[PDB]
Amino acid sequence: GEVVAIVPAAGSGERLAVGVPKAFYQLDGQTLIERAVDGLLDSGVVDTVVVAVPADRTDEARQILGHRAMIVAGGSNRTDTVNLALTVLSGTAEPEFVLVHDAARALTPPALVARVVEALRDGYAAVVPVLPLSDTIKAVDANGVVLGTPERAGLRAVQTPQGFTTDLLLRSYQRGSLDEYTDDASLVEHIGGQVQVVDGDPLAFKITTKLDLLLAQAIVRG
Amino acid sequence: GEVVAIVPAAGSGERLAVGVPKAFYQLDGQTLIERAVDGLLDSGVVDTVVVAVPADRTDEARQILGHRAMIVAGGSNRTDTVNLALTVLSGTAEPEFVLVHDAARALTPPALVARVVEALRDGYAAVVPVLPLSDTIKAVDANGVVLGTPERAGLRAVQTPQGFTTDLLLRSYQRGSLDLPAAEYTDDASLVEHIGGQVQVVDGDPLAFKITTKLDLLLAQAIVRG
Numbered sequence: 305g306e307v308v309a310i311v312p313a314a315g316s317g318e319r320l321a322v323g324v325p326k327a328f329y330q331l332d333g334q335t336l337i338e339r340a341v342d343g344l345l346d347s348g349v350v351d352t353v354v355v356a357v358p359a360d361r362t363d364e365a366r367q368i369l370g371h372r373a374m375i376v377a378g379g380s381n382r383t384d385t386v387n388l389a390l391t392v393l394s395g396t397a398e399p400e401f402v403l404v405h406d407a408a409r410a411l412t413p414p415a416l417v418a419r420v421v422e423a424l425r426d427g428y429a430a431v432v433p434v435l436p437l438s439d440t441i442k443a444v445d446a447n448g449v450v451l452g453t454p455e456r457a458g459l460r461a462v463q464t465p466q467g468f469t470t471d472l473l474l475r476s477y478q479r480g481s482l483d484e485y486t487d488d489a490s491l492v493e494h495i496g497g498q499v500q501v502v503d504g505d506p507l508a509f510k511i512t513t514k515l516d517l518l519l520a521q522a523i524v525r526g
Numbered sequence: 527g528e529v530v531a532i533v534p535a536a537g538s539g540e541r542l543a544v545g546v547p548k549a550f551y552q553l554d555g556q557t558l559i560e561r562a563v564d565g566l567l568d569s570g571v572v573d574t575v576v577v578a579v580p581a582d583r584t585d586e587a588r589q590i591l592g593h594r595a596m597i598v599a600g601g602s603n604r605t606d607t608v609n610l611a612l613t614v615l616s617g618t619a620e621p622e623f624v625l626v627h628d629a630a631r632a633l634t635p636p637a638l639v640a641r642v643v644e645a646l647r648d649g650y651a652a653v654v655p656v657l658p659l660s661d662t663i664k665a666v667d668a669n670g671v672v673l674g675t676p677e678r679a680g681l682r683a684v685q686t687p688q689g690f691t692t693d694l695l696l697r698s699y700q701r702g703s704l705d706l707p708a709a710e711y712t713d714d715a716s717l718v719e720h721i722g723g724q725v726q727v728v729d730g731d732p733l734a735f736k737i738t739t740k741l742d743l744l745l746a747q748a749i750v751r752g
């Protein structure tokens with residue numbers, strides 16, 4: 305059973321503001337996109353990686369990644385990007401599983417990727433890696449008034465790679481197109497698909513702000 | 527009107543596993559407890575700090591803090607510690623406002639402390655600093671099956687200092703029906719919400735993160751050196 309990983313890397317990273325689109329930032333000698341691609345490939349369970357990048361960076365992405373990933377242009381939002389990437393999937397020989405993995409989670413351990421794939425092979429149709437909440441979480445209305453504080457025991461913070469049987473992911477995206485989710489599993493939940501969690505890893509944090517970058521730098525050097 | 531800040535620092539920092547109770551860990555030459563106290567006082571709007579520490583650490587806390595903070599013995603959990611600290615408050619000269627601030631958020635900027643007090647002076651009865659969510663949140667069962675994904679838009683991550691009108695906070699903690707040894711509250715506002723106090727949000731600050739793990743510590747260190 306073949307496993308394809310789709311890597312959305314086409315966002316600009318406005319909250320990061322490092323002078324270049326985020327996926328192309330050089331973290332201690334190596335771009336975030338190459339790091340995220342290595343994590344996937346080093347897992348030993350990913351057969352093909354397809355990366356989606358800004359349309360004017362496809363050449364640069366190719367120079368960086370060479371043979372290691374197929375390159376396509378991303379879209380206006382992450383959902384668009386993923387839809388574009390899914391069109392690459394072979395008609396005649398479709399993979400058994402697809403992972404979707406944010407390039408922004410560049411320090412994701414390969415062991416986490418393998419754990420997601422192991423859960424898929426155990427028969428779960430949709431799998432997401434999760435961690436317990438760090439901060440208290442509150443529901444807040446539009447005027448900044450707290451509505452309440454959900455019981456945290458039943459809440460989790462969700463990471464990527466998220467993994468799916470191919471047919472389920474495709475159906476979910478096709479049906480979702482009949483209706484701004486940031487989370488692939490939400491689309492599967494929407495058509496009544498059932499999602500199982502596995503343990504994530506604090507190292508799979510999304511590099512979003514400069515403080516996230518500082519943390520990534522401290523991890524990587526030393 | 528007086529502002530008293532209470533600092534729960536009576537936790538053992540098991541997840542940090544750094545040799546001493548977390549509040550007493552020396553981050554680049556300063557204990558977290560001293561850094562937390564400094565951020566409150568440098569705000570310019572905190573009149574008095576009460577710090578609660580593990581009972582066997584009270585003398586050491588005083589030698590560290592000197593005149594800068596009043597020290598008391600904490601309790602079996604965060605909620606219990608805070609309740610103990612609240613008993614310290616003068617009844618004849620009650621402060622107008624009380625802040626509650628985790629010592630584990632040692633890099634909190636003084637500006638944040640000021641922003642919270644400013645909201646209380648704007649007439650909000652209770653105030654919490656917040657940040658948008660980083661990860662998607664899901665509700666999950668027993669079991670590990672996803673129950674659903676709440677709308678991210680209406681959710682916030684919440685930090686400290688949390689600020690309150692004194693009477694509201696006292697009534698939330700002296701609720702007779704509150705079983706203190708079994709209290710699993712992570713923050714103070716949820717006790718205020720429980721009795722129907724209205725809580726207002728202000729912008730927090732990424733620098734006010736809780737130092738809980740080695741990874742948090744790594745980040746805190748890179749922040750204080752750089």
Ligand SMILES: Nc1ccn([C@@H]2O[C@H](COP(=O)(O)OP(=O)(O)OP(=O)(O)O)[C@@H](O)[C@H]2O)c(=O)n1
Binds near residue numbers: 311356379382383
């Ligand atoms: N049109 C888009 C937008 C985002 N992504 C990717 O989806 C992942 C998650 O996006 P996120 O980090 O949340 O936002 P960014 O767009 O990358 O950054 P920002 O919102 O601050 O601009 C990122 O790897 C990003 O490159 C994408 O492929 N295509």
Ligand SMILES: Nc1ccn([C@@H]2O[C@H](COP(=O)(O)OP(=O)(O)OP(=O)(O)O)[C@@H](O)[C@H]2O)c(=O)n1
Binds near residue numbers: 539
């Ligand atoms: N009995 C307790 C427990 C916690 N706290 C304080 O509450 C804050 C938050 O605690 P938290 O970081 O969640 O747990 P810790 O006890 O500090 O660490 P750990 O859970 O890993 O042991 C800390 O400043 C901590 O010192 C406290 O004053 N008294």
Ligand SMILES: [Mg+2]
Binds near residue numbers: 315
């Ligand atoms: Mg975005």
Ligand SMILES: [Mg+2]
Binds near residue numbers: 537538
């Ligand atoms: Mg604790």
